[PDB]
Amino acid sequence: HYDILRRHIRSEDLLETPEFGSGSRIVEEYWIQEPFTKAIIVENEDEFRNVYYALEPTVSSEEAEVISALYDDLKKILVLQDVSVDLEERAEVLVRAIEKLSKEYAVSFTDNFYSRMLYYLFRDFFGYGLIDPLMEDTNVEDISCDGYNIPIFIYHQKYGNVETNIVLDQEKLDRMVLRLTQRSGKHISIANPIVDATLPDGSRLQATFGTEVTPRGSSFTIRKFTIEPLTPIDLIEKGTVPSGVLAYLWLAIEHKFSAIVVGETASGKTTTLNAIMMFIPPDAKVVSIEDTREIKLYHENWIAEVTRTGEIDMYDLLRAALRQRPDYIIVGEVRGREAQTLFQAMSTGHASYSTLHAGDINQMVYRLESEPLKVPRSMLQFLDIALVQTMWVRGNTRLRRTKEVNEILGIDPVDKNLLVNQFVKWDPKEDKHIEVSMPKKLEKMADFLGVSVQEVYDEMLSRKRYLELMLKRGIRNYKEVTRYIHAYYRNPELAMTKMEEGL
Amino acid sequence: IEHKFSAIVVGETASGKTTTLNAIMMFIPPDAKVVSIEDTREIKLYHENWIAEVTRTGMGEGEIDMYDLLRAALRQRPDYIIVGEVRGREAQTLFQAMSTGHASYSTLHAGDINQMVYRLESEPLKVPRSMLQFLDIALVQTMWVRGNTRLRRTKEVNEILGIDPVDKNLLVNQFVKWDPKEDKHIEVSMPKKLEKMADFLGVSVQEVYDEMLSRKRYLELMLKRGIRNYKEVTRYIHAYYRNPELAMTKMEEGL
Amino acid sequence: HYDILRRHIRSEDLLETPEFGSGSRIVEEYWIQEPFTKAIIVENEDEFRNVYYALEPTVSSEEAEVISALYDDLKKILVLQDVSVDLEERAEVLVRAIEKTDNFYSRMLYYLFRDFFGYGLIDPLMEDTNVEDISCDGYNIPIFIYHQKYGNVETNIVLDQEKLDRMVLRLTQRSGKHISIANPIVDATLPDGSRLQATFGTEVTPRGSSFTIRKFTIEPLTPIDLIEKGTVPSGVLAYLWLAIEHKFSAIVVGETASGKTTTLNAIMMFIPPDAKVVSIEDTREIKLYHENWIAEVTRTGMGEGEIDMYDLLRAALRQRPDYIIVGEVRGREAQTLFQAMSTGHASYSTLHAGDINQMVYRLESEPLKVPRSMLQFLDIALVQTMWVRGNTRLRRTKEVNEILGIDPVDKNLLVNQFVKWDPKEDKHIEVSMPKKLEKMADFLGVSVQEVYDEMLSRKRYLELMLKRGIRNYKEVTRYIHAYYRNPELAMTKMEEGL
């Protein structure tokens, strides 16, 4: 979007320098998208806190009025406000149109006021409007707008919870919500005032309309979607999952053990699933079914299926894909009926993985067995690993942590109880993952290979070493990480040497 | 409350449940995001980053109950969740929020922890036995009368330590008890939750204990200075959060 | 398709030779449709992986639009595409129509055919019986396949947007469906009898249109085969042959990748030539060289009425099947099956489990929920295994279990273990008498020694087929059908290499 804009810019230096009186001290400044936006962390020292300032190109009461004027005309054009169209060409339908209205009304603006007016038109037409800067700043992970005349709050990757300078009044906020809502294909109104949707880019939306069910006015909450997939290295570095557990999981998904990663909504479940899904052997056939395109993989032999909300559901896609011979099936989040199918896939030898909304393992079982999912108890035996994610909150810090790793051994012959083994448990105290025991799944692997448990264990340590070597060498991006993992697959010793040899 | 220990205010009817809750909800950290779900507004809070959600009857539209609202509120990011009073199904979601780290608070119609447990476990609430472990504190409120002697007292401060494997289950440590004979609050056990705090904070107990005594003084002073209003009280509390040092000094210097 | 063609051609030295730069070693090479297409399995030292290269008669870029032109006209010939017309005749027109080098001719008809009667770009993959799975994931992505021996390998066949979009319409149409943005997903079955999943556009497949084809090319392992692989001893196989002829019902149980289906399909070639057999599967896997047979396959209901195994069995058991085969019991239908058993229908099926206890549990508990008392009608339950050491990959029948019946006031399931497999010596040990052989005496109305004699007889017959290297299922089934018809004559021909 902005690269296109930066093209027609027609000038730079559109930003001035803020006037924060005393009792206010700049803590940090940084371009969000130069030369238009900029974030300025300001410290209102009187109140011993910081306050995110979204800085946009300055305009005067007269100027903005002029801008708003063009918007009204350009607004007539439907193309530029049509999502099905390529941003790039409707970005010109805009500049080429402003050219008309300009030369016609016989006027020539300032090279600057253009490279300023232009910013606003794009923003309110293509961008996210008033919150665009927040929607842009990579540091902002969440956006929370409680209501009429209430400042937007956000979660900053470095300052955590912080008050923002952006404030929407009723007229503005209502539009904002409708816009966000509409932009997500779903509809909101006094009739049905609550909406749980996902924006075009994947960010999750939670909106409310009017004061029907929410006095204080309409409100919305966005949980931005990071474009770049965290990798198992990212996870080792972030203290979220130990390199050993990660090695353990590598072997586990190689040997097609099916796993489900459990957690609370927004606990980092998908992020983790995507990360460990980078351990899939290179040539295998991967099939992914989701309601919202989220998983990003550097795996050629893969088909990414997506749900249609109108009508084609996961269930349909899942049983369909199951008629073939896929090596790995990814679901993303079992929420109903298909949950049964997914567990059957397991029963019939398919490496199956998915996300599930629950807090404990107890809660997992409960949520699995009861409607709408309704997975019979006899079938749970077919799940191999169950991870539990948690988002540890202490002060102005967030910690996505693999809270616990569980192994489903089987179903007890009495009371048909699920045999489980928790071999790794996180400790919030020292923020240390603890191995309450050794993985029982290592024996299943040993047999499947004809080697001694001891032999598998050492393989693990090896991969573990490889991972930490990749970390130490600063290999974090998914494409490059996947590249090096596929390598170890193709040939381990050659791969190891090349890792510890600089290549 | 600052540390997010969840609490339910239990009490017979006309004992003070809601009042007390609303009272101690003015202890929420100035910047934390709080969402409340009530059948009808009753909770007043001098807090900004706050979403107030109210149930819909559905008289002539789509009925939206507490279950729907909580289910979808817990969904955004609330640091604190306040449910006016649990009167059914939504109760499960709440305790789920608890097992998840959401500082959850609410009210329940009952006279003692036993009744509380019964009501919570049995339909309509039907909260699973094992989930109870995530509730931290349960206050029990009362009404006490003699002459025109109209008294609302916290009968007891109960600390829910957790569950017992092979049990009776609900492990409760009673911190404070109220003697009506002398109208006095007696400590009848150690405030164990203060130790869990040491663990969270990463400090010692005496250290936390010190801060408690400190916060205590701060309150008694506000009292002596006649700072009664909620808007003003919340301001001085928000104050102490921001900087207890400066906050304490201004209070000792009538400003 | 290729016999009709390959004669109308002139030259026979069509298609040059492959040229792979260094680091691109040639592992193997073999013919597909001589002398047009040939497949080469190349290596790649760097990435320890093999690659499938689909070789077709090379052409000139001038011949390109040239042959693409001769096609631009032949297309407007409705009388060609028409499938109602026999391929033998249809071909003729294309030839005659083309009349309106003596080498370029042949290495051209190939394509003209490959696009009118063939499968187009993927014909090399559809004709090669080594490729049992075809995965075209997306736009400009090399197709992947599952080779009978090489498994997952990349391919030299890629399709850009349009090239694939039309391919998806071709496959969709030959299967009899109409894939469109309105109905972007198709799960049909191709004329050659193959499973085809297909997606048009990018509504459900962001990675563009796509398709997958799981070819029914199987070549089902044979009883003789099981003997060779040392999976099941010849003696046990004879015992089963009799068992099956007499309609004793059997379930093949085993952990995953142990051989359940293989073994079943194997021992299902023991069904009497004239008996009526009906099979119900979630997806075809069972190959049988039997005529009086009805094969029924479950329907997903993607966009129509869903018909599950329960529906199919319920209504199959309804006609007169002497033998009923259920691919694998994964639910409700299981009850109907055991009902069929209590009724005398020689019923067979597979079940995911490790030992009789697990089998029982799964069968009794939901979703299957087969009533405790019904189990008595199951006769034999084989337990299959996977065994490994070095590259030592072994599939063995761990145990032949005879279900004697139910016990009043019990523990219930009375099982007599006939054969056990010792992995230490890789030997099958008899650990009890084959009681079912006595039930046979009772059925047949003869003595045990008598039946026992026939078993030893049938046993010999099998070992001989082995010695004579009769491995194929079509041929094996014939010699078995043989013995049924006349064991006397059958035995003599076998001893006299004929």
Last residue of a domain, one of C184, C217, C250: C217
List of chains touching C (3+ CB pairs within 8 A):
A
Number of domains in chain B: 1
Q: Which of the residues A300, A324, A329 would you substitute to probe the C interface, choosing the one with the greatest number of C C-beta atoms within 10 Å?
A: A324
Asked if A23 has any chain C CB less than 8 Å from its own CB, the reply is no
Inter-residue contact B107 to B8 (CB < 8 Å): yes
Asked if C83 has any chain A CB less than 8 Å from its own CB, the reply is no
A285 interaction partners in chain C (CB closer than 8 Å): 133, 135, 144, 146, 152
Same domain as A177, residue A242: no
Nearest by CB: C49 against A376, A416, A490: A490
Q: Two tokens at A77?
A: 């054009």
Asked if B52 has any chain A CB less than 8 Å from its own CB, the reply is yes
CB-count burial class (<10 Å; 0-12, 13-18, 19+) for A143: buried
Task: State how far the Cα of B28 lies from the Cα of B81, in Å rounded to an integer.
Answer: 11
Same domain as A255, residue A112: no
Same domain as A125, residue A91: yes
Task: State how far the Cα of B32 lies from the Cα of B127, in Å rounded to an integer.
Answer: 27
CATH of the domain at C381: 3.40.50.300
Nearest residue on chain B to A45, alpha-carbon basis: B242
CATH of the domain at B109: 3.40.50.300
Same domain as A279, residue A210: no
Measure Cα distances from B202 to A62, A431, B197, B226, C325 in Å. Answer: 56, 11, 8, 35, 66
Spatial neighbors of A44 by CB under 8 A, at least 6 apart, are A23, A24, A50, A51
The distance of Cα C179 from the centroid of its chain, to the nearest Å, equals 27
Inter-residue contact C190 to C146 (CB < 8 Å): no
Spatial neighbors of B54 by CB under 8 A, at least 6 apart, are A213, A214, A215, B37, B38, B39, B40, B41
Give the helix/strand (H/E) hosting A119. Answer: helix A111-125
The distance of Cα C392 from the centroid of its chain, to the nearest Å, equals 25
Restricting to A residues 409-428, those with a Cβ less than 8 Å away from any Cβ of C are: 411, 413, 416
Nearest residue on chain A to C357, alpha-carbon basis: A413
Number of domains in chain A: 2
Last residue of a domain, one of C160, C182, C217: C217
Same domain as A241, residue A214: no
Q: Which of the residues A84, A299, A378, A448 would you substitute to probe the C interface, choosing the one with the greatest number of C C-beta atoms within 10 Å?
A: A378
Interchain pair A363, B96: CB under 8 A: yes
Restricting to B residues 231-250, those with a Cβ less than 8 Å away from any Cβ of A are: 242-243
Domain of residue A137, residue span: 1-226
C388 interaction partners in chain A (CB closer than 8 Å): 447-450
DSSP string, B105-167: EEEEE-SSHHHHHHHHHSTTT---GGGGGG--EEEEEEEEESSS-EEEEEEEEEEEEE--SSS
Inter-residue contact C384 to C253 (CB < 8 Å): yes
DSSP code of C86? -
Inter-residue contact A324 to C133 (CB < 8 Å): yes
Task: State how far the Cα of C202 lies from the Cα of C303, in Å rounded to an integer.
Answer: 19
C197 interaction partners in chain A (CB closer than 8 Å): 320-321, 323-324
Cis preceding-peptide flag for B124 (omega within 30 of 0):
yes
The distance of Cα C456 from the centroid of its chain, to the nearest Å, equals 31
Method: X-ray
Measure Cα distances from C191 to A91, A190, A207, C169, C402 in Å. Answer: 49, 54, 51, 14, 42
Asked if A448 has any chain C CB less than 8 Å from its own CB, the reply is yes
Question: In chain B, how many H helices and how many E strands?
Answer: 8, 9
How far A367 CA sits from the closest chain C CA (Å)? Answer: 18
CATH of the domain at A118: 3.30.450.380
Interchain pair A450, C388: CB under 8 A: yes
Same domain as A179, residue A313: no
* Known binding positions of A for Mg(2+): 270
Domain of residue B160, residue span: 1-255
Same domain as A218, residue A234: no
Can you name the residues that pair with B36 across neighbouring β-strands? B52, B82
C141 interaction partners in chain A (CB closer than 8 Å): 300
Q: Residue A430: phi, psi to the nearest 5?
A: -90, 5
Sheet with C37-42: strands ordered across? C26-33, C37-42, C51-55, C151-155, C144-147, C131-136, C210-214, C194-199, C185-190
How far A161 CA sits from the closest chain B CA (Å)? Answer: 7
Q: Which of the residues C213, C256, C398 would you substitute to probe the A interface, choosing the one with the greatest number of A C-beta atoms within 10 Å?
A: C256
Interchain pair C137, A377: CB under 8 A: no
Same domain as A304, residue A163: no
Nearest by CB: C133 against A302, A319, A325: A325
Same domain as A195, residue A238: no
* Other C-beta atoms lying within 10 Å of the C-beta of residue C129: 12
Same domain as C98, residue C52: yes
Interchain pair A394, B200: CB under 8 A: yes
Amino acid at residue number A213: V
Last residue of a domain, one of A205, A226, A247: A226
Specify the 3-state DSSP secondary structure of C423.
Answer: coil
Restricting to C residues 104-163, those with a Cβ less than 8 Å away from any Cβ of A are: 133, 135, 137-138, 141-142, 144, 146, 151-154
The distance of Cα C464 from the centroid of its chain, to the nearest Å, equals 26
Nearest by CB: A359 against B53, B72, B99: B99
Asked if C181 has any chain A CB less than 8 Å from its own CB, the reply is no
Same domain as C240, residue C193: no
Nearest by CB: C197 against A282, A301, A320: A320
Residues in chain B, how many?
255
Nearest residue on chain A to B48, alpha-carbon basis: A150
The distance of Cα C492 from the centroid of its chain, to the nearest Å, equals 33
CB-count burial class (<10 Å; 0-12, 13-18, 19+) for A119: buried
How far B54 CA sits from the closest chain A CA (Å)? Answer: 5
Inter-residue contact C494 to C461 (CB < 8 Å): yes
Inter-residue contact C1 to C87 (CB < 8 Å): yes
Asked if A186 has any chain C CB less than 8 Å from its own CB, the reply is no
Q: Two tokens at C452?
A: 């026992």
- Using alpha carbons, select from B85, C158, C405, B48 the residue that is nearest to residue A151: B48
Restricting to A residues 373-402, those with a Cβ less than 8 Å away from any Cβ of C are: 376-379
Nearest by CB: A215 against B52, B77, B96: B52
How far B66 CA sits from the closest chain A CA (Å)? Answer: 11
Q: Which of the residues B44, B77, B80 would you substitute to probe the A interface, choosing the one with the greatest number of A C-beta atoms within 10 Å?
A: B77
How far B148 CA sits from the closest chain A CA (Å)? Answer: 39
Specify the 3-state DSSP secondary structure of B79.
Answer: coil
Nearest by CB: C185 against A302, A320, A416: A320
How far C152 CA sits from the closest chain A CA (Å)? Answer: 6
Inter-residue contact A323 to C186 (CB < 8 Å): no
How far A214 CA sits from the closest chain B CA (Å)? Answer: 5
Same domain as C183, residue C239: no
The C-alpha angle with vertex A407 and arms to A401 and A412, in degrees rounded to 5, equals: 140
Q: Residue A54: phi, psi to the nearest 5?
A: -80, 115
Interchain pair A376, C366: CB under 8 A: yes
Asked if B128 has any chain A CB less than 8 Å from its own CB, the reply is yes
DSSP H helical ranges for A166-313: 170-182, 232-237, 243-254, 269-276
Task: State how far the Cα of B192 lies from the Cα of B136, in Å rounded to an integer.
Answer: 11
Q: Two tokens at A345?
A: 């896939």
Interchain pair A208, B53: CB under 8 A: yes
Nearest by CB: A325 against C146, C328, C365: C146
Q: Which of the residues C352, C355, C411 would you substitute to probe the A interface, choosing the one with the greatest number of A C-beta atoms within 10 Å?
A: C352
A366 interaction partners in chain B (CB closer than 8 Å): 128
Hey, which bits of chain B come out as E strands? 7-11, 34-38, 50-54, 80-83, 103-109, 137-145, 150-162, 171-179, 184-187
- Using alpha carbons, select from A417, A319, A422 the residue that is nearest to residue A377: A417
Q: Which of the residues B61, B74, B76 would you substitute to probe the A interface, choosing the one with the greatest number of A C-beta atoms within 10 Å?
A: B76
- Count Cβ–Cβ pairs < 8 Å, chain A vs chain B: 90
List of chains touching B (3+ CB pairs within 8 A):
A
Q: Establish whether chain B is in contact with chain C, requiring a minimum of 3 CB pairs below 8 angstroms.
A: no
Terminal Cα distance for chain B, rounded: 26
